[PDB]
Design a protein around this nucleic acid. Structure first.
Ligand SMILES: [Mg+2]
Ligand SMILES: [Mg+2]
Ligand SMILES: [Zn+2]
Lengths: 246, 81, 49
RNA sequence: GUGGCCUAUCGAUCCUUUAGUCCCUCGGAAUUUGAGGCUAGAGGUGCCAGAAAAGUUACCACAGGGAUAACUGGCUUGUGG
RNA sequence: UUUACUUAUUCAAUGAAGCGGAGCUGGAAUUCAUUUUCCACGUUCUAGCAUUCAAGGUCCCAUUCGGGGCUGAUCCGGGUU
RNA sequence: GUGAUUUCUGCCCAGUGCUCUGAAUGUCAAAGUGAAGAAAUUCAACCAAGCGCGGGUAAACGGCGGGAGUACUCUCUUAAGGUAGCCAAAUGCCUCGUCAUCUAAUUAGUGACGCGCAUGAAUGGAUUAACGAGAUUCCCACUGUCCCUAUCUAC
RNA sequence: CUUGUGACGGCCCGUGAAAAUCCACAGGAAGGAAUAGUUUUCAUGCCAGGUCGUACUGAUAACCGCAGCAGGUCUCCAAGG
RNA sequence: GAUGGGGAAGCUCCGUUUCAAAGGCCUGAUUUUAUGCAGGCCACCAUCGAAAGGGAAUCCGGUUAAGAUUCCGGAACCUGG
RNA sequence: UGGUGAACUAUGCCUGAAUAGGGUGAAGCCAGAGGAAACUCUGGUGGAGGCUCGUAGCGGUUCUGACGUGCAAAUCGAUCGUCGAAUUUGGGUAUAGGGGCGAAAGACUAAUCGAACCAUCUAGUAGCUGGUUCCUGCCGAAGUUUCCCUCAGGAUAGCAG
RNA sequence: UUGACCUCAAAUCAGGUAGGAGUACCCGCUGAACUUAAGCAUAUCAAUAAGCGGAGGAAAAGAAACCAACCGGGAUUGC
């Protein structure tokens, strides 16, 4: 048999992400001294479109506290942020949309976004368009906060992790039908080479586990063990249940 | 049309001249000579290519310094006049 | 061997989620039927007497 | 009288194991375990003078064969007419 | 089996900048004798601006063209976090 | 995996897979423990995961039966017994199925019928405007395809 | 008609390169005049600008298809009815 | 695609700013003077990669058997000093 | 076993380039009319679409035409599909052989692909096919027995010198 | 303040050295399969071919942690 397509994807020859027209990694400002002892005020200069990303970005300018210069950070724009808005980042920042408060200093029921997992990785959770994280509870002794993720999971992270208050702009995108293979082409043309997708049941048996036969059919069960090896994991990996529930 | 019409599309050299051997075996994109191995420090040779070793071995050129070593040895590496 | 896995992946969990996941995985029906099998184990002796 | 009234009713090498001799050897010398030998059986090859063994190929390949099939022709004429 | 500890090992960030402890200065605090503690400990109407070892105060120099120290900007441990 | 829209996607977890935070001596390696021995060693206990036991899962692979009585009911078998739809369909052996229509005449076409060798529901079922160098049947126009051939030009 | 350009409008779950290089602004370091300077982003005046390529075909005969092969091979200009 | 590093028995592989003590920049000061010592500034961090991308500056007339925005005549422009 | 190829072609990236004339007439907007109001109607404007007829271009349906020791190891002629985009294409660049790439044909990877090419191991093995080079003299067969994964082959006995 | 020590650096510091070629023979690493077994998997081919590292006129080995069991021999190498 041959090496199958998902097995070939990990070499990264033609499967790397197309990153020519992207404007930089959208990270939070680094947690130096001002953000953990007070706050700092920056300005939204422009809200721009990011190639291959459903959400817009915001170019926020701060002043460097140690040197006479300007720092320009790329935030993921929250819905409601406008150009010329003052953005406040820090422990003592007031609770408004766009501010970059740590999660220990927000009450119950707060909706945040671009949430750090550990304090300092500059944004990991709820970064796609329309997604958000809800603070479910606090725990001052052994200082942690429980959060509800966009997947519905409940995480318990540190209370020193930061998050931008509000929801990510650009929500409701996937409600519009694409209607066209050309539209899907232009969508994935700026992301990566993973489209179009040939069904493995329509291949030859040298090319896929599902290939072959005088009728297009899978053969064995399509639920694959987690202990399976590379070249075997083609189908529903480690499925607890299948089928459409009612 | 994989034959005669496809042979008309051939006008871009994959290999150019090499600096150590002058062979036209220097791959343009790989930046490596396929015959002598430039720019590696060792020269490309293989024991299965014994006839190629015979083609490029010592004595197939001028031996601009090595022609006189036996004569200087026979005279005993003398100095003076 | 079971107690290692709960510390590994189910440490941060609450009882609403725990009941939801075991109901979605079907182990609760198995626990119910094991206790039911104990109930007819007692009940058949009672009917014999 | 050296099994079944007679003509059928069954099995090599290697390996393991048993019985006998309690005999021979473990090679610097001894004792005791252990191991290896000798003689006679057993564990089995039914493809039965005894390889350890699933398919598919209409994508196919090679060496050959008229020792061998799918046409005609030839012998035959059951069957057919 | 649970549970400390950190220096081995592991992960992450930064142009290794504000770590830890103590002390001021305010507020709450009830003190049962004098302070037990706990929070703070220069910035939020506005798409401006913020840099020249910092101005001021103070002490020297050898005045002049200026120069240096302390404070402004609390101490202590050199564990970057 | 299936393949726009519309309309639906029935029953079955027995088997094969996949999956559990269940319950816990059945299987049970090396290391380690104990006993016997002079030791090599032998024998036991203990014994992780996975198997084994217990659940879930079919838009997972798949599967969707018989005998009586009067379509219906009952009884067996099994995990459950083909539901809604559709059909001599590109899927029907028998088969050139039977009836109607189309023709002078039709193993072709279309519309019906259905004990369907061997239809059937994301193995997707049924329907469907527009589109097609896709496959098939009929009609009008048209003609050397033909009755039945003849003639002319260039090379 | 060809082409350049301007102000617009439509489209996107597509909003459609980077660096060298050059200029300006903020800032006020420093240098500075009166018998004299300060300015060469104003005008004129002086000197130098190295190396390699440079012919021709670009196709029913200059390229590739064994060849003077009806094949293949990127592009600019484009009169009248 | 080197270096610092880390793999690999090794030919070599990874990585391109990384767990590196990674450098040069202008003013000058001195006028035994060479360029150290007075200073002060800055932290990218090799290099290769387009004869269609970016990019300092040239046009007309004439001239040869065969060259020309390149020669000749005239008229310009840019860069460095 | 060790090397060489993405000059053809497959795919992604980077940077460039190319594409007559028509037909239909989408939103938005303007005027008139009607209505009690919701809003409807009529006439314009506008110029949308992986729309359409059709050049250049890209492709290759049929004649199963020509040719078929050809112009040609895939061409020529007519008829065709498509023609503003999932378009066509230059150059640069990346992926290398049990590997790549594949809108999936086991297709393409230099006229080579159900595992490229080059050299070596290698004079690989063959119970199978073909061949096996002067004269004369004398003698002169077998296709049968037994065993064998034996049935196109051997061993053994027989026949012969 | 000054002078040591240790450790770590920088110099177009003073002087040197390594790389590559050849490779018949030599010292190592790595390492097949064709083939034979009348099939084939252990085996064989073979501790070979290919690949990699390193020398010399030779290299390597070499003066016993040896061979022996005898009345004992006496570094290594080769026939
Ligand atoms: Mg793709
Ligand atoms: Mg299949
Ligand atoms: Zn070379």
């Amino acid at each position: 048999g041959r090496v199958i397509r998902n097995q070939r994807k990990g070499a990264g020859s033609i499967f790397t992400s197309h990153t020519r027209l992207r404007q930089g990694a959208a990270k939070l400002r680094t947690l130096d001294y001002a953000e953990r002892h007070g706050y700092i005020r920056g300005i939204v200069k422009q809200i721009v479109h990011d190639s291959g990303r459903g959400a817009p970005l915001a170019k926020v300018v701060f002043r460097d506290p140690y040197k006479y210069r300007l720092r320009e950070e790329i935030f993921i724009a929250n819905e409601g942020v406008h150009t010329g808005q003052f953005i406040y980042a820090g422990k003592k920042a007031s609770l408004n949309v766009g501010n970059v408060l740590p999660l220990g200093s927000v009450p119950e029921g707060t909706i945040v976004s671009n949430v750090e997992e550990k304090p300092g990785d500059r944004g990991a959770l709820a970064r796609a368009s329309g997604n958000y994280v809800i603070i479910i509870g606090h725990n001052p002794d052994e200082n942690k906060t429980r959060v509800r993720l966009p997947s519905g999971a409940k995480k318990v992270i540190s209370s020193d992790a930061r998050g931008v208050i509000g929801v990510i702009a650009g929500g409701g995108r996937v409600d519009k039908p694409l209607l066209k293979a050309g539209r899907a082409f232009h969508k994935y043309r700026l992301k990566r080479n993973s489209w179009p997708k040939t069904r493995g049941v329509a291949m030859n048996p040298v090319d896929h586990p599902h290939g072959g036969g005088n009728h297009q059919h899978i053969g064995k069960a399509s639920t694959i063990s987690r202990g399976a090896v590379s070249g075997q994991k083609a189908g529903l990996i480690a499925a607890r249940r299948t089928g459409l529930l009612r | 049309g994989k034959g005669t019409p496809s042979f008309g599309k051939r006008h871009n050299k994959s290999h150019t001249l090499c600096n150590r051997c002058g062979r036209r075996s220097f791959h343009v994109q790989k930046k490596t000579c396929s015959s002598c191995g430039y720019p590696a420090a060792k020269t490309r040779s293989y024991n299965w290519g014994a006839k190629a070793k015979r083609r490029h071995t010592t004595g197939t050129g001028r031996m601009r310094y090595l022609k006189h070593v036996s004569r200087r040895f026979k005279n005993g590496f003398q100095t003076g006049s | 061997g079971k107690l290692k896995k709960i510390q590994k992946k189910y440490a941060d969990q609450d009882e609403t989620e725990r009941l939801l996941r075991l109901e979605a995985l079907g182990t609760l029906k198995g626990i119910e039927k094991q206790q039911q099998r104990k109930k007819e184990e007692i009940m058949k002796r009672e009917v014999r007497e």
